[PDB]
Design a protein around this ligand. Sequence first.
Ligand SMILES: *[C@@H]1O[C@H](CO)[C@@H](O[C@@H]2O[C@H](CO)[C@@H](O)[C@H](O)[C@H]2NC(C)=O)[C@H](O)[C@H]1NC(C)=O
Ligand SMILES: *[C@@H]1O[C@H](CO)[C@@H](O[C@@H]2O[C@H](CO)[C@@H](O)[C@H](O)[C@H]2NC(C)=O)[C@H](O)[C@H]1NC(C)=O
Ligand SMILES: CCCc1nc2c(N)nc3ccccc3c2s1
Ligand SMILES: CCCc1nc2c(N)nc3ccccc3c2s1
Ligand SMILES: *[C@@H]1O[C@H](CO)[C@@H](O)[C@H](O)[C@H]1NC(C)=O
Ligand SMILES: *[C@@H]1O[C@H](CO)[C@@H](O)[C@H](O)[C@H]1NC(C)=O
Ligand SMILES: *[C@@H]1O[C@H](CO)[C@@H](O)[C@H](O)[C@H]1NC(C)=O
Ligand SMILES: *[C@@H]1O[C@H](CO)[C@@H](O)[C@H](O)[C@H]1NC(C)=O
Ligand SMILES: *[C@@H]1O[C@H](CO)[C@@H](O)[C@H](O)[C@H]1NC(C)=O
Ligand SMILES: *[C@@H]1O[C@H](CO)[C@@H](O)[C@H](O)[C@H]1NC(C)=O
Ligand SMILES: *[C@@H]1O[C@H](CO)[C@@H](O)[C@H](O)[C@H]1NC(C)=O
Ligand SMILES: *[C@@H]1O[C@H](CO)[C@@H](O)[C@H](O)[C@H]1NC(C)=O
Ligand SMILES: *[C@@H]1O[C@H](CO)[C@@H](O)[C@H](O)[C@H]1NC(C)=O
Ligand SMILES: *[C@@H]1O[C@H](CO)[C@@H](O)[C@H](O)[C@H]1NC(C)=O
Ligand SMILES: *[C@@H]1O[C@H](CO)[C@@H](O)[C@H](O)[C@H]1NC(C)=O
Lengths: 772, 772
Amino acid sequence: ARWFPKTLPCDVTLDVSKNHVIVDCTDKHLTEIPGGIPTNTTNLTLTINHIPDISPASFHRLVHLVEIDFRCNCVPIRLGSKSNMCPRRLQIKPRSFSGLTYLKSLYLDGNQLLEIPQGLPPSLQLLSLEANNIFSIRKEQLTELANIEILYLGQNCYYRNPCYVSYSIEKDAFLNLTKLKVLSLKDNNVTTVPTVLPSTLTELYLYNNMIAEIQEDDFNNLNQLQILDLSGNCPRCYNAPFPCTPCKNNSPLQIPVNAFDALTELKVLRLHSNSLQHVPPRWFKNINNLQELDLSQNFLAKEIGDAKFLHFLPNLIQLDLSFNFELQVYRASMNLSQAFSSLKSLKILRIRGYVFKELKSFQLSPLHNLQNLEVLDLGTNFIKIANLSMFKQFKRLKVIDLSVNKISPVLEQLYYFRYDKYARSCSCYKYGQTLDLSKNSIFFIKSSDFQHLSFLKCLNLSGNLISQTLNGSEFQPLAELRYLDFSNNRLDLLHSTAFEELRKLEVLDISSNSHYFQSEGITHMLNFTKNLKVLQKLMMNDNDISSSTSRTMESESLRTLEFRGNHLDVLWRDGDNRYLQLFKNLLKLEELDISKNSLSFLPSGVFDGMPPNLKNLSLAKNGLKSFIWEKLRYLKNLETLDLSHNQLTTVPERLSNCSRSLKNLILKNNQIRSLTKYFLQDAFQLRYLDLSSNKIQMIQKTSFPENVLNNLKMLLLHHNRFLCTCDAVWFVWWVQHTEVTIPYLATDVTCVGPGAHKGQSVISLDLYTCEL
Amino acid sequence: ARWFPKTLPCDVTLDVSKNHVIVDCTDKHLTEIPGGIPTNTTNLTLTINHIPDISPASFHRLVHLVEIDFRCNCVPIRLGSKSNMCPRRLQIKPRSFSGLTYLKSLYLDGNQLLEIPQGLPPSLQLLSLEANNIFSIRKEQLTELANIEILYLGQNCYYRNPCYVSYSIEKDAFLNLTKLKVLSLKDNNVTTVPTVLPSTLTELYLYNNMIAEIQEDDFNNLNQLQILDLSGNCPRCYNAPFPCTPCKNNSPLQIPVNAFDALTELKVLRLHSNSLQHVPPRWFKNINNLQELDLSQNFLAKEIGDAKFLHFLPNLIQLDLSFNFELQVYRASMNLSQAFSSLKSLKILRIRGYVFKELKSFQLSPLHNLQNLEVLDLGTNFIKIANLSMFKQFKRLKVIDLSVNKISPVLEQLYYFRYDKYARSCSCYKYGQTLDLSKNSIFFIKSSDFQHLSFLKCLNLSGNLISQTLNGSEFQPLAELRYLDFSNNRLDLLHSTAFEELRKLEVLDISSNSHYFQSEGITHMLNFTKNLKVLQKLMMNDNDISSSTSRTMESESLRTLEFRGNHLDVLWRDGDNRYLQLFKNLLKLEELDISKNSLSFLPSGVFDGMPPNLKNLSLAKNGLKSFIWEKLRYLKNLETLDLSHNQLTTVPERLSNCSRSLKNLILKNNQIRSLTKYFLQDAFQLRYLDLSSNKIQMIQKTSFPENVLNNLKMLLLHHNRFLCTCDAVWFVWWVQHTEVTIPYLATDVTCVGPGAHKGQSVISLDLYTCEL
Ligand SMILES: *[C@@H]1O[C@H](CO)[C@@H](O[C@@H]2O[C@H](CO)[C@@H](O)[C@H](O)[C@H]2NC(C)=O)[C@H](O)[C@H]1NC(C)=O
Ligand SMILES: *[C@@H]1O[C@H](CO)[C@@H](O[C@@H]2O[C@H](CO)[C@@H](O)[C@H](O)[C@H]2NC(C)=O)[C@H](O)[C@H]1NC(C)=O
Ligand SMILES: CCCc1nc2c(N)nc3ccccc3c2s1
Ligand SMILES: CCCc1nc2c(N)nc3ccccc3c2s1
Ligand SMILES: *[C@@H]1O[C@H](CO)[C@@H](O)[C@H](O)[C@H]1NC(C)=O
Ligand SMILES: *[C@@H]1O[C@H](CO)[C@@H](O)[C@H](O)[C@H]1NC(C)=O
Ligand SMILES: *[C@@H]1O[C@H](CO)[C@@H](O)[C@H](O)[C@H]1NC(C)=O
Ligand SMILES: *[C@@H]1O[C@H](CO)[C@@H](O)[C@H](O)[C@H]1NC(C)=O
Ligand SMILES: *[C@@H]1O[C@H](CO)[C@@H](O)[C@H](O)[C@H]1NC(C)=O
Ligand SMILES: *[C@@H]1O[C@H](CO)[C@@H](O)[C@H](O)[C@H]1NC(C)=O
Ligand SMILES: *[C@@H]1O[C@H](CO)[C@@H](O)[C@H](O)[C@H]1NC(C)=O
Ligand SMILES: *[C@@H]1O[C@H](CO)[C@@H](O)[C@H](O)[C@H]1NC(C)=O
Ligand SMILES: *[C@@H]1O[C@H](CO)[C@@H](O)[C@H](O)[C@H]1NC(C)=O
Ligand SMILES: *[C@@H]1O[C@H](CO)[C@@H](O)[C@H](O)[C@H]1NC(C)=O
Ligand SMILES: *[C@@H]1O[C@H](CO)[C@@H](O)[C@H](O)[C@H]1NC(C)=O
C-alpha cells in the first residue's frame, strides 16, 4: 500500500492550496535534526527537543523554508524540566540562517541565547527570542532586521529567569526598524520607556518591568499605536502569588496628563497593577477610539465613585475595575459614579474584588440604560445581601456573574493574580441569560427568591450550601429556565416532584450532591425524572449513590445520563435483582456514563436491562476483571463502547459475532496480552479501535483482516509489549507499509525485545535476516 | 545463616508456649495441599485457595492437627470472584478426617458442600459449614458430633446463596448433642424454631429467616441461654438494601407473651427488624438479667412514648430503638415515656431514625437521673432545632451523637440497614466528653451557641456548612476543648486569631476546607497557629492551598502537621523563594505529611527550610521525577522517609553519606531499575527498606552488605523485574538462605526471565548449572 515507509520521527502534512509542506517534530526527544526532512519543507517545528546546536548543515537543503519553530531546546533552568535540565546553551554557528532567503518567521524562544542571532536573512518578518538571556539591546545588533514587523524579546530578565541587572536599550535602538509593528519587552527589568520608537508601531507591550515614570513625550510619535500595555510597573503586591516589589513610598506609575496625546488610534490601554489612585480625565482627551480599558489591581476604590474620565470613553467596549479595594476595608455598599451612564458602547463591565457587604438595586442604576451591556461581573466581592429581583432591569444581559460571594437568603482560574496571563508555553452561556450564583452561601431557596426573573435561561447554583428537599415549589418563577447547575450542594431527593416546576428544563446537573446518599437508611427518589418532559441531559456524577427507594428511573425525553462516581456495584450486588432495570425506561436514552462505579464485574441482566436506543456506553475505570462479550448482542444500537482503564485480559473471539452495530471500541489501559485469532473478522461496522497501553506481544494477520482495517479511521497500538522476532514479520511489515492512521509510531510503538532490538521502534525495524 | 532454605509457600510460626506449630497458607493461589507441611503442625489454614478435593492423603502425616481452617476453596457463585469462579464443588473423600484424632476445630465454610461431612473425629468441639449448600438437617447426620460445642450452619439458603426451598430440620435433630453451646442457623430460609433443642445452649442465632411465629414452648428447656437473636423474621423492608419479603398482613413476628419464661440466664435479646408494633411487658417478667436489647427497625414509634416494659429491665445496659419511625410521618418532637427513668443500669441508648423536627431539654428529662448513661445517639433524625445548652445536664456522658441531622441556628457506615452485620468474610472519644455535630447544617457559629457546655473535651463539627471568618470569639465557652474537628466546612482564614480562644486545644482538623483557597486573590492567614500554645496536631489536608498571605507558620508546641492534598508545587514555584521556610518555625514539629502536593521536583531550599526536629517525612504521591539525596543532610533527625508512589529512578550512591539518622526508607512504587554500587554500605542505622514495585533487575552484594541487612527488621522486594541469570547467583542464594523478613516470597518475588525461569519464584530457583 506504500512503497517507501516513512521513518522520519515527524508528522508531515501537505496543504496543497498554499503550497506548504509542514513538518512537525514537536516533542520527539531528538538530539539531532532528523535526516530526510523533505526538501520542499516550508514549515518546520523542532520545539521541545534537545538539539544542542544549529549549523549551516542544519537547514542546508531546505531552501524553501518560510518558518522555523525552534523553541525550547534549552529552556532556562527554573522554567524547564528539573529531571532533564539542559547542560549548555543552544549554539548557533555562522551562516546557519543566511541561505534561507524565504524565511519569514523564526522562533528561538527558550534556548538560553546570550545575544541576538546575527546573519539573519532580510526576508524575516517575525523574530521571537522570549525566555533567553539577552538583556542588552544595541542598535548594531538590529541592523540585520531591516524588514522586521514583529519582535518578541520578553522574559529575558525576570524572577523565573533572572539576569541580575537592569535591562539596557541603546537610544533609538529600534528607530530604523521602519517596518516594525509589534514590539514586546515584557518581563524584562526594563527601567525606562525606550525612545525613540518607530512610528509604525501598532502594539507595544512594556508590562511587568521597572518603569517608574512615563516621560511626557515617550509615545509622542506613535500615531498608529493600537495596543499599549504598561501593566505591572509599580505593582500592587498584596496577595501577589509571585515575588513582587512595589515602587517606593507607595507611588504609582507616574503618567503625565498629556502622555497619550499622540495615540489617536489607541484601541487597548492596559494599566493593570500600576498602583493607581486616580485616573485623570485629561489622559483621554485625544483618544476617542478606546475600546478596552484594564484598570484592575490598582487603588481606585474611591475613584470608582467619582470616575470623571468615563465621560471621555463613549466608545469603550470593555472596562475592568477589579481588585481595587482598600486593604482591610469592608465597605457597606458599592458606590458607582453616575459617570458610568455615559459608557454608551459598554458591553463588558468587571468589578471583582471591590469587597462590600450589601448590593442594592439603586447602586446599579448608573448602568440601567447602557443598552449594549452584555456581561456584568461582580464576583469575589464578599457580598452577603443581594435581592436577586433587581436583575429584572438587566434582562438584556447575556451573563450576570455573582460567583464567589457570601449571598444567602469564562476567565482562567488564575487571571487577575497570575504574573503574565499571556505567557507562552513551550458551560451554559449559550442557552441565553445566565445568572451565576455559584460558590455563594445559599442554604435555603424559596419561590419568591427568584421573582421577576422568569426571563432566565441558565441558573448556576453550583457550590452553595443548599441542604433542602425540593418538592416542585422552589423555582416557580423560572418559567424559561433551560439549564440548572445544582452541583456541589446537598440536594435531598425525598420527593419525586423535585424540579418539576422547571417545565422548559433541558439540562439538570445534580452531581456532587453526595451528602444524603452517604448515610444509610435515607430515602432517595431517583424516579424524579418522569415529571421533566423536555429534559435532555442529566448529570448525577460523584453522588456515591449506593441505594435507592425507587427501582426504575423513567423519561421519554432524556438523551444523556451521566452516572459516574456512584456505587452501582452495591446497587447491583450479586443476588439482588431489584435495580437491574434502573435505566430501562429512559426510553430515548442514547448516552450512558457508568464509569467509576467500582463495577469489577457486571451481573446477569445489566445489558438486557439497558434502554433500547443506547448508543454511547462508558464502563471505564471500574476495575473490570472480566466481561462476557456476547452480552453486547442485547445492545442493538450500541455504537461506542469505552472499556478503558480496567483489568480486561481478552478480546472476543469474533467481535462481529458480539455486536453488529459497534463502531468505536476503546480498550486502552487494560491487561490484554494477545488478540484472538479471528478478532476483527467481518467487523464491517468497526471504525475506531484503541488497543493502546496493553501488554500485547504479537499480532497476526488472521486477527486483522484488511477489509476491516481499510475502514478504520484510527487504530491505536502504542505502549504495548511487542516482541520483534521473526514471528512478527507480518505485523512489522504491515505497520511499516499501511495507510491506516496509527498515532505515535515515532515515539511509542516499539519492541520490548529480543535483546538486540529492545527499545527500538518497529517502524525502523529491519527483518531481512528472517528471509535469508 | 540457614542450612535448609524454606520451600513451603506458607508462613510457619511456633508458639512454643502451648506447643503449637502454625502453618498459614491463606491466599497462596494453591491448587494442591503443599508437600512438606511440618508433621508437628497443629494449626493448618488453607483459606482462599483452589484446592478441589480432600482425601486421606491430605493430612495423613499431620497427626497432631488440632485445627483445620479450610474455608473458601469453592465460594458460592454470587459471593465469590466472577473472574476466577470455582468450576466444581469441593470433594471430600471418606476417611479424610477420621485419623485426625486430636482435631478440635474444623472450618469448611464456603466450599459448596451438599452434606455435613461424615467421618469426623470425636474430639471435635467446633464445626463450621457456613455458605455451603446444606439445607436439610437429619438427626442421623449429626451422630458423629456427640462432643460438639459450637456449630455454624448459616448462609446455606438465602438470596446470595439460594436453595429454592424451605430449610428443613428433623425433629429433635440437635437434642442428643448434649454439649452444644452455640448453634447458628441464620440466613437459612428456616420456617420454624427447631425443637427440641439441647438445654446446654448458651447462644442461639435464628435471624434472617422465615419464622412467622414463636410457639409458647419453643424455648422451654433453655435453662442456660444467654444470647438469642430472632432478628429479620418478618423484616421491616422500607429502604432495605437487600431483597426483602415482609410477612403477610404487615404481621409482626408473633411471640407469645410467655415465650421467654424459661430464659433466666438471658443477657442479650435481639429482635431487630421483626416488624413489632408492641413490646408486651410480660415478655420480661422472668428475665431480670437482660443487659442488651435491640429493637431497631420495627414499628415502635408510638410504643416509645409508652414502653411500660422498660420497668422490668433494671439491669439493662444497652437499649436500641433506632429506625422505628412511622413511614411518611415527620413528628414535631420526641416523646419519650417516663418509663425510661427506671433503666437505672443503662449505659448506651440509641434512637436514630425516630425522625422529628425539634429537640427540647424537656423531652430528655426521663434520662436525667440515669447515672450510668454514657452514650446517647440521636443521629439520622432530621432534627432542625436543638438548643445545645440542654446538654449541660448530661456532662457524665462520654458521647452525645447528633450526627446526620439538619441542626442550624463507632458503628459501621452500613449498620442498621445491612443484611448481616455479623457476616464472616473469607477518633476523639478518648479525649473525653464528645458532642458529635457532624453532618448537620450549621452555617454560622457564635459563642452563645455553646453556652453552658464548658465541660466538652471534643467537638465534632465536620461536614457542616460553616462559611465564616473566625476571629477568636466563636468558641469562647469551650474552655476545656482538646479536639476540634472542623473538617469539611468552608473556613475563611482572614484573621490570624482564629481558634485562639480554645486555650486547651491539642488537635485541630481543618481538612477539606478548600472553598476559599480555590478562588484567586483571597487572603489566607496560615500563621494563625502561633496563638495555640498547647496545639499538638494540625490537619489541613485536601485544602488546595496554593497561596498564603503570611510566609511562615509558627508554633512552639505543634508536633504533627498533615499538609497532604495541597499545592506546595505552586507555593514553591521555581524562582519564588518567599515560602521556602513555611514550616521552619514549627520548632518542635516531628511529623510532616506533604504527600499529594504535585511536587514533581523539590526546589533547593526546601530541606534547609525544614524545622530542626523533623522525624517522619512523607513526600509520597507527588510524581517526583528527581531527588537530590545529599540534601537529606539538612534533616539530621530524620528517621522515616516515605517516597512511595513517585517516579524516582535512582537511589543515593552512598545512603550513609545522605543521612546518618535514617531508619525507614520507603521507595515502593517508583521506576528504579538498578541500585548504586555501594548503596547501603555503612548504613548501620537503617532498619526498614521497601523497594517493592520497582523495575530492579539485579542486586549485587556490594549494594547489599550483610552487616546492614543483619539489622533489617523487614526488606520488601516483591514485584520487581529480577533477571535470574548466573549474575544473580549471590542475590538468589542470599534470599533463599537469609534470616531477614521478606514478604511475598511465595507469590510475588519472581524471575521475569530468562526463558524457562520466567514466572518462577526466586525462592524455588536452582542455579547449579552456574557452578558446573
Ligand atoms: C533588576 O535590576 C536590579 C538592579 O537594577 C537587579 O538588582 C541587583 O541584584 C544584585 C544581585 O541580586 C544585587 O546584589 C544588587 O544589590 C541589586 N541592585 C539593586 C539596585 O537592587 C535585579 O536582580 C534585576 N532583577 C532580576 C529579576 O534580574
Ligand atoms: C425459600 O423457600 C421458598 C419456598 O418456601 C422458595 O420459594 C420457591 O421458589 C421456587 C423457585 O424460585 C418457586 O418455583 C416456588 O414457587 C417458591 N415457593 C414459594 C412458596 O415461594 C425460595 O426460593 C427460597 N428462598 C431462597 C433465598 O432460597
Ligand atoms: C430513615 C429516614 C427515612 C427518611 N429519609 C428522609 C429524607 N431523605 N429527607 C427528610 C427530610 C425531612 C424529614 C424527614 C426526612 C427523611 S426520613
Ligand atoms: C478580595 C481579596 C482580599 C480579601 N480576602 C478576604 C477574606 N479571606 N475574607 C473576607 C471576609 C469578609 C470581607 C472581605 C474578605 C476578604 S477581602
Ligand atoms: C507556516 O509558516 C508560515 C510562515 O510564517 C505562516 O505564515 C503560516 O501561518 C504557517 N502555517 C502553518 C499551518 O504552520
Ligand atoms: C460616592 O463616592 C464619591 C467619590 O468618593 C463621593 O463623592 C460621593 O459622595 C459618594 N456617594 C455615595 C452615594 O456614596
Ligand atoms: C426584592 O425586591 C423585589 C422588587 O423587585 C420585591 O418585590 C421583594 O419584596 C424584595 N424582597 C425582599 C426580601 O426584600
Ligand atoms: C457553574 O459554575 C461552576 C463554578 O464556577 C462552574 O464549574 C460550572 O462550569 C458552571 N456551570 C455551567 C453550566 O457553566
Ligand atoms: C413544598 O414545600 C414548601 C416549603 O416547605 C411549601 O411552601 C409547599 O406548600 C410544599 N408543598 C406541598 C405539596 O406540601
Ligand atoms: C417514585 O417511586 C416511589 C417509590 O416507590 C413511588 O412511591 C412514587 O410514587 C414514584 N413517583 C413517580 C413520579 O414515579
Ligand atoms: C454468531 O455466530 C453464530 C455462529 O455463526 C450464529 O449462529 C449467530 O447467529 C451469530 N450472531 C449472533 C448475534 O448470535
Ligand atoms: C490453634 O487452633 C486451636 C484449635 O482450634 C485454637 O483453639 C487456637 O486458638 C489456635 N492457636 C493459634 C496460636 O493459632
Ligand atoms: C406520647 O406518646 C404516648 C404513647 O402513645 C401518648 O400516650 C402520650 O399522650 C404522648 N404524649 C405527648 C406529650 O406527646
Ligand atoms: C467527626 O465526624 C466525622 C463524620 O461522621 C467522622 O468521619 C470523624 O471521624 C469524626 N471526628 C473524630 C475526631 O472522631
Ligand atoms: C500573619 O502574617 C501576616 C502577613 O505576613 C501579618 O500581617 C500578621 O500580623 C501575622 N499574624 C500573626 C503572626 O499572628
